[PDB]
Paper text:
To provide structural insights into SB transposition, we crystallized the catalytic domain (aa 114–340; including most of the flexible inter-domain linker that spans aa 110–127) of the current most active SB transposase variant, SB100X, and solved its structure at 1.4 Å resolution. The catalytic residues (D153, D244 and E279) are assembled in close proximity establishing an active site conformation similar to the one observed in the crystal structure of the homologous Mos1 transposase PEC (grey in Figs 1a,b). In the Mos1 PEC, the clamp loop is extended and interacts with the similarly extended linker and both tnp ends across the dimer interface, playing an important role in PEC assembly. In turn, in our SB100X catalytic domain crystals, the clamp loop is curved, mostly pivoting on three consecutive G-s (aa 188–190, marked with red arrow in Fig. 1a) in the glycine-rich strip, and contributes to an extended protein–protein interface (2,350 Å2 surface area; ΔG=−27.2 kcal mol−1)29 between symmetry related molecules in neighbouring asymmetric units. In addition, the tip of the clamp loop contains two short antiparallel β-strands (aa 169–171 and 174–176), which form a β-hairpin and interact with the main chain of the inter-domain linker (aa 119–122) of the partner molecule. However, as the observed arrangement of the catalytic domains is too compact to allow DNA to access the active sites, it does not appear compatible with PEC assembly.
SB is a member of the widespread Tc1/mariner superfamily of DNA transposons that has been developed as a genome engineering tool in a broad range of organisms. Tc1/mariner transposases contain an N-terminal bipartite PAIRED-like10 DNA-binding domain (DBD) consisting of two helix-turn-helix motifs, and a C-terminal catalytic domain with an RNaseH-like fold and a catalytic triad of three acidic residues (DDE)1 that execute DNA hydrolysis (in excision) and transesterification (in integration) in a two metal ion-dependent manner. The 39 kDa SB transposase (340 amino acids (aa)) features a similar domain composition to other Tc1/mariner transposases.
Residue numbers in the entry:
A (entry chain B): 5 to 230
B (entry chain A): 7 to 230
Write the structure that this text describes.
């Protein structure tokens, strides 16, 4: 008991997380390698606590002497939809404005089966997406059914169980290091760096996956470290 | 126990003369030298293992590559200068620089840089022994415009701290992974702006140690 790890941070939907984690606790490695994970993310050009050079004066790039903390600088941002599996990155798509169900269907049309083929996933491959209500809207459910897509069981409020959240941090690190100064550049750097992310990086994310399910069970469905 | 040089320099006599003749100079002297040189920055460095193409969405390096001294991305050629107090002008050279383009670059940028860097009245200009620098026209421009030129030993880039500054600019620009020459040029000017006086000053503060090593090594090649 004392020697067990006890969670300090609660998660909602702990019973659903236990149903997911216990039932997938003995799935084999091939199965996890053939899950196509997916999510959206937002990348800011000027990160809210990135100490960037803001102006040039007398030939020197300058950072401000005095700043007030903020949650959001100017400079704008890009929103992205992406997918990946253990074997590598799938499609990356810039999303414009708020995404609705019809727009989500169009994203899947284009990019889902092309990604699966490019990644050479096996015949029993499974698609993962989160529990946004748009994902079971009539038009989306019909597209998934008509295109024979198998959808992974999924608990709500569980980004610590989707390794794509690690992949986005890798993309952000690569993009940030190229020091973009405008949004056309931010877009092109996101696509270029996504294309460079190593297949072995992706593989290492998925290799670690069953340990996440072990920790969800140990923590009775509360928040994991991941 | 003494350090003994493993690599010879053909111009050890002149190097040893330079170090002897300058080894007593105060730090003020080195802070008032305006160092200068040109450098070429390749878009696709000859042994940079860059991704060359995309196929099936994946960026790819070739399965088999033969070494080369030069890839086909093109390059930018730059003239620059600096002193302990900071960067001077950075200028993109048009094609291949001849003596007239060199005089023109000096017009525009040399004394502007001395002004902006606030060098003392006895500032000195440094540049290497490229035959162009000794031409009737460059030598006459320097004399007419009252520029004092540092006496300079051949094959001695290890004694010009701007070669470190060029490597710093190249590191910064390469890390931004440019994919065309327009970007390469813009990144060079952006990154030059990020190189500050403290960096420049630390290079020059270390300079007497270079002269110490030239003397220890009897004019042969240093580590620098």
């Amino acid at each position: 008991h004392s020697a067990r790890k006890k969670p300090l941070l609660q998660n909602r939907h702990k019973k659903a997380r236990l149903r997911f984690a216990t039932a997938h606790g003995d799935k084999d490695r091939t199965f996890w390698r053939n899950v196509l994970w997916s999510d959206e993310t937002k990348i800011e050009l000027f990160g809210h606590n990135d100490h960037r050079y803001v102006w040039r004066k007398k030939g020197e790039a300058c950072k401000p002497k005095n700043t007030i903390p903020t949650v959001k600088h100017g400079g704008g941002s890009i929103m992205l939809w992406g997918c990946f599996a253990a074997g590598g990155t799938g499609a990356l798509h810039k999303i414009d404005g708020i995404m609705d169900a019809v727009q989500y269907v169009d994203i899947l049309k284009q990019h889902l089966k092309t990604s699966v083929r490019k990644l050479k996933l096996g015949r029993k491959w499974v698609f993962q997406h989160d529990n946004d209500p748009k994902h079971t809207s009539k038009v989306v459910a019909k597209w998934l059914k008509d295109n024979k897509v198998k959808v992974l069981e999924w608990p709500s409020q569980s980004p610590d169980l989707n390794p794509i959240e690690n992949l986005w941090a890798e993309l952000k690190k690569r993009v940030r290091a190229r020091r973009p100064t405008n949004l056309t550049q931010l877009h092109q750097l996101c696509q270029e760096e996504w294309a460079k992310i190593h297949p072995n990086y992706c593989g290492k994310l998925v290799e670690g996956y069953p340990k996440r399910l072990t920790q969800v069970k140990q923590f009775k469905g509360n928040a994991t470290k991941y």
